């Protein structure tokens, strides 16, 4: 009785939203950026190759100094590299070897990991004792953690395979806010530059815009055909790119609230594991299952270059804060820095 | 290089040595992935052989066995099943006393899960030890409730031997492309201490194949 009425009302509201966001599409991004000169051909070369991991790399995160980076592998290791000298700073042994994510704090005093243990571990990198020790274990999720991102030294946002994101308080150990609007497993997180809001991509082929302070969903974006595995804000904070198992990347605008462009090629059939943006936002770097990375022109959706050099699946990649280099990890147990 | 840079290089070398030692230690352990239903019987298997996922460590005849139970992960397993790409074996438990029971028959749910795991692209050449637990309840219950409830096309004698053989054949027939992996089937009860020997025998074959692969000739 009432369930059918509510379903009809939901369908009417969805149609209203679709009509509203179809009436503000007077042009496309391809049409506007058709008169700008394309970037010719990006020839990045492997400046550094970081060796030492003995299993699959599942995550990496650059530090804010653009020199130190953290990497997570199933060998039970969290390794911190000094990318200039290619020498290791710390090697943290995890209690659970099934790591799927890692984060580097903006201050540089903490690291985070998590995975199939359903716990986010925060390690203090700077102690009077010379070792790195577990400072906090955050245990409130009923599913595996797929991404963690520091807001500051005390707030961390996590996304889990229990169809839920969580904003925590590291000192008290309790999750301050719970974001629950998804249907499938949330696989990726991305923080906005202003820290006031973030975006989550899930296994229900949807992306959601979460307000951190309020705790509710602002907008939902639905243009993908399969699981969303990676997500990344544009440097402006008014757009974001998503990657999915359907071999497509996608640009969504927050203010227009719809798709802008699709980055896909008929020669690409494998899924996307990572997306990142250049410092200016002109390039879009996507890591693929077909063992290599692709550099697209974010304003024209054409393949500017190919970063080949990995023997297995590319799992994670990130661009430094100064835009100097890209770091790509893979299942072949190697990290590579490109410039 | 400066003095501090040289000391940093020395620290990195020590870290490399420790990582190599830990990798050598971890490459000699046998990894088992325990799969099954909650009432299928894995707690009995664990007890005989000894939130998140549960890790059980045991030792049997100069081997260290790490058993990973992922039953608490009530999520889309297509997003974390590749974490066990390199695993020595998969121990799949089925309680063959659930043919009558219903959660959709439990037995068909076990069959579907076995079909998904056996034919997964991450386990093309991974051995499967198939445990068929609760044989005593099956023998007691086969007299009253016939196997026709689970298999309408059975058409066989209602004895323990024939029904057990039919169950084993039905599970082994789900193995599409049954030339690139081996399936070991054992019938077990609660009061039975022979399962560690069965797992050891199954793992020995995998080790032989693995260190023939290391020695070039596959």
């Amino acid at each position, epitope marked *: 009785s009432e369930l059918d009425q509510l379903r009809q009302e939901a369908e009417q509201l969805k149609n209203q939203i679709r009509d509203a966001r179809k009436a503000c599409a007077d042009a496309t991004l391809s049409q506007i950026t058709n008169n700008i000169d394309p970037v010719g051909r990006i020839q990045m070369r492997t400046r550094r190759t970081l060796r030492g991991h003995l299993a699959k790399i599942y995550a990496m995160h650059w530090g804010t100094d653009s*020199r*130190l980076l953290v990497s997570a592998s199933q060998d039970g290791k969290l390794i911190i590299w*000094d990318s200039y*000298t290619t020498n290791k*700073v*710390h090697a943290i042994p995890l209690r659970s070897s099934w790591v799927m994510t890692c984060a580097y704090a903006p201050s*540089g005093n903490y690291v985070a990991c998590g995975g199939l243990d359903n716990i986010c571990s925060i390690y203090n990198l700077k102690t*009077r*004792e*010379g*070792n790195v020790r577990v400072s906090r274990e955050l245990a409130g999720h009923t599913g595996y953690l797929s991404c963690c991102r520091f807001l500051d030294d005390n707030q961390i946002v996590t996304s889990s395979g229990d169809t839920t994101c969580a904003l925590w308080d590291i000192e008290t150990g309790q999750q301050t806010t719970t974001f629950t609007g998804h249907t499938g497993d949330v696989m990726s997180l991305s923080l906005a530059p202003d820290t006031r809001l973030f975006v989550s991509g899930a296994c229900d082929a949807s992306a959601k815009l979460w307000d951190v302070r309020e705790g509710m969903c602002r907008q939902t974006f639905t243009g993908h055909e399969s699981d969303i595995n990676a997500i990344c804000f544009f440097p402006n904070g008014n757009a974001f790119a998503t990657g999915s198992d359907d071999a497509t990347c996608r640009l969504f605008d927050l203010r227009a609230d719809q798709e802008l462009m699709t980055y896909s090629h008929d020669n690409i059939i494998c899924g996307i594991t990572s997306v990142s943006f250049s410092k200016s936002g002109r390039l879009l770097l996507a890591g693929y299952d077909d063992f290599n990375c692709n550099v697209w022109d974010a304003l024209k959706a054409d393949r500017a270059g190919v970063l080949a050099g990995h023997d297995n699946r590319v799992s994670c990649l990130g661009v430094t804060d100064d835009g100097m280099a890209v770091a790509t990890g893979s299942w072949d147990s190697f990290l590579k820095i490109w410039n | 290089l*400066s*003095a*501090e*840079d*040289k*000391a*940093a290089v*020395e*620290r990195s070398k*020590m870290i490399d040595r420790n990582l190599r030692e830990d990798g050598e230690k971890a490459a000699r352990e046998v990894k088992l992935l325990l799969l099954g239903a909650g009432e299928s019987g894995k707690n009995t298997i664990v007890k005989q052989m000894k939130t998140g996922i549960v890790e059980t460590h045991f030792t049997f005849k100069d081997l260290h066995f790490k058993m990973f139970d992922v039953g608490a992960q009530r999520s889309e397993r297509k997003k974390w099943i590749h974490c066990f790409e390199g695993v020595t074996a998969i121990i799949f438990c089925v309680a063959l006393s659930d043919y009558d029971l219903v959660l959709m028959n439990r037995m068909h749910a076990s069959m579907k899960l076995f079909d998904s795991i056996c034919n997964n692209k991450w386990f093309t050449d991974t051995s499967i030890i198939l445990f068929l637990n609760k044989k005593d309840l099956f023998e007691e219950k086969i007299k009253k409730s016939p196997l026709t409830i689970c298999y309408p096309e059975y058409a066989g004698s209602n004895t323990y031997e024939e029904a057990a053989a039919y169950i084993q054949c039905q599970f082994e027939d789900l193995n599409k492309r049954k030339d690139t992996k081996e399936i070991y089937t054992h019938f077990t009860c609660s009061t039975d201490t022979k399962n560690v020997q069965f797992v050891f025998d199954a793992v020995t074959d995998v080790i032989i194949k693995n260190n023939l692969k290391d020695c070039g000739l596959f």
Partner: single-chain antibody, 232 residues
Framework: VQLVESGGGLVQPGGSRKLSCSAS????????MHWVRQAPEKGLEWVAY????????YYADTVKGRFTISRDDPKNTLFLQMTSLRSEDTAMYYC??????????????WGQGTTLTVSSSDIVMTQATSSVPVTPGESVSISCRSS???????????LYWFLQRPGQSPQLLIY???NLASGVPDRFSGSGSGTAFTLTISRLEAEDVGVYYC?????????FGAGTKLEL
């Protein structure tokens, strides 16, 4: 976190003695260790260095081949074995903890040292100032000069400013010029270029009255500079 010294005392000339230092409170195996001595009324002087893993050992030319360094990681004990003790070996011996990675703070913890009395191509670091009269609340600058550029090609300047209060072991203030050590008030700052360096105290209480020392870590044998005393 502490490093407690042991040994020392009065030695007839030409003898041998084993100074010890027990660590308690930190991961001793991952910390390089130094022995640094101070004459009864003179300034500091670096004696020896042994790295984590016992793979690198450096001695000062004044005791090279005469002193020996060693470490027992399970026992957390650092040893200095001294043979043929000359009368120029009478001093206070300090065990210094230092760790070296990117962004480290070498020379950040010191023991209390052991007194030792014996009975009857090196960079020169210059501190021309000495016994500067200071009033509380003022701003003070301490100058330092080097006989070589301390700026390496990596972009680092290996100047260390330590503070030794009257009756206390020296404490790190700055480890690479303008880098402020942990637990030090923000009223301290450092500036410099090449062979010239200044350490500035903006407004000072009675706690930071003592002797300030410059130290070069560009290359061994880690020469010090005669300290500049602040007098109230």
């Amino acid at each position: 976190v502490q490093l407690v010294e042991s040994g020392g005392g009065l030695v007839q000339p030409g003898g041998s003695r084993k100074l010890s230092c027990s660590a308690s409170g930190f991961a001793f195996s991952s910390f390089g260790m130094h022995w640094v001595r101070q004459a009864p009324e003179k300034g500091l002087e670096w004696v020896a260095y042994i790295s984590s893993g016992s793979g690198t050992i450096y001695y000062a030319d004044t005791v090279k081949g005469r002193f020996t360094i060693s470490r027992d990681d399970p026992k957390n004990t650092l040893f200095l074995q001294m043979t043929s003790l000359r009368s120029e070996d009478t001093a206070m011996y300090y065990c210094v903890r230092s760790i070296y990675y990117y962004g480290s703070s070498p020379f950040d913890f010191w023991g209390q040292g052991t007194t030792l009395t014996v009975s009857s191509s090196d960079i020169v670091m210059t501190q021309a100032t000495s016994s500067v009269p200071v009033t509380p609340g003022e701003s003070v600058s301490i100058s330092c000069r080097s006989s070589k550029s301390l700026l390496h090609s990596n972009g680092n300047t290996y100047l260390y400013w330590f503070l030794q209060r009257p009756g206390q072991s020296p404490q790190l203030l700055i480890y690479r010029m303008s880098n402020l050590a942990s637990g030090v008030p923000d009223r301290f700052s450092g500036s410099g270029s090449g062979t010239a360096f200044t350490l500035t105290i903006s407004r000072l209480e009675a706690e930071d009255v003592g002797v300030y020392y410059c130290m070069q870590h560009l290359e061994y044998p880690l020469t010090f500079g005669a300290g500049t005393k602040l007098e109230l």
